[PDB]
Paper text:
To determine if the patient-derived p85α BH domain mutations impacted the overall folded structure of the BH domain, several of these BH domain mutants were crystalized and their structures were determined using X-ray crystallography. X-ray diffraction data collection and structure refinement statistics for bovine p85α (105–319) mutants (E137K, E217K, R262T, E297K) are provided in Supplementary Table S1. In contrast, the bladder cancer-associated p85α mutants, E137K and R262T, showed a slightly enhanced Rab5 binding. Several patient-derived mutations within the BH domain of p85α can enhance PTEN binding (e.g. R262T) that may help to stabilize PTEN by blocking its ubiquitination. Further, crystal structure determinations for several of these mutant BH domains indicated that no major structural alterations were present. No significant differences in protein flexibility were observed for any of the mutant proteins, suggesting that the mutations did not alter the rigidity of the domain.
Residue numbers in the entry:
A (entry chain B): 113 to 167, 172 to 276, 280 to 297
B (entry chain A): 113 to 166, 172 to 275, 279 to 298
Write the structure that this text describes.
């Protein structure tokens, strides 16, 4: 796992990591209407998927392999798209706060902290934008904000324990409200 | 006070913040042989110097560029050498009072995945600058030890045989650049 930190992969005025842009754009061109996108086990194994990530046009690859590399990317980031500091604070407020808008208000506040490079919030915005376009063809790919939230929240937050359904819900809402 | 974090000012494959490159290159073109470079204060005040940090910097008085260079290091939200690293080096004991070991630890901590690569990259660029200045010591009177004593309080932003060791390793890292 040699994948660099989100903050090391790009900086403003760029809006997202160049490699993540290549994946998203390729995946959207080839799999926007695929009813199994992101819900399959492809043939490749982590070492193979890392080869694709560590070293020419992604449109040449099987869409299900790109989808696995997309997941591999999020798993291999040294720190998750949503830092653990943020996840830890949102998780510990769970019994107290039962307001989705406030959780959303707070997630944005914490991830915009000066102690966290802007690249993380920028990356999350790019990912949410991608998840939203997938949901605009949910009739065909079956990916709605809730299903997209259930697939990718454990990758964005990097959590495997049951005081967590609130985190999944904010991602759902953050996808639907773009 | 509005200066962005080093990790937000650039990313690999760039080697240093673009503004810092403009300062260093301008200062080296106009003041490489100046006998009082970095050891006198110019007329401008912090507010004026900050205006400059937002044209071609070769137009400015060299002593203003030198003060803006210092202003830059002071205004970074986190210093070139993060406090995480400084705190560990300061905590070292009389036993491990080996310069080679202090340097070994600085490299280990500042290359940590929890600290963006931009910080170590920035320090390397500065060391390359300090070394080039010390190669003209016959004319500008700047040796590695004085450069370390002048700039260490700006790099670390933090007095005993521990702080004497931090200044000493910077000295060594300047002289041992090539």
């Amino acid at each position: 796992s040699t994948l660099p930190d989100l903050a090391e992969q790009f900086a403003p005025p760029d809006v997202a990591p160049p490699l993540l842009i290549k994946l998203v754009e390729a995946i959207e061109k080839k799999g926007l209407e695929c009813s199994t996108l992101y819900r399959t086990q492809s043939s490749s194994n982590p070492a193979e998927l890392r080869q694709l990530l560590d070293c020419l046009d992604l449109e040449m690859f099987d869409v299900h392999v790109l989808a696995d590399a997309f997941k591999r990317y999020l798993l291999d980031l040294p720190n998750p798209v949503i830092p653990v500091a943020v996840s830890s604070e949102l998780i510990s407020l769970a019994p107290e706060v039962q307001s989705s808008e406030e959780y959303i208000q707070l997630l944005k506040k914490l991830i915009r902290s000066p102690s966290i490079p802007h690249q993380y919030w920028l990356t999350l915005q790019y990912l949410l934008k991608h998840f939203f376009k997938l949901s605009q063809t949910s009739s065909k790919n079956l990916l709605n904000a809730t299903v997209l939230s259930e697939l990718f929240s454990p990758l964005l937050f990097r959590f495997p324990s049951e005081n967590t359904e609130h985190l999944i819900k904010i991602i759902e809402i953050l996808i639907s409200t773009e």
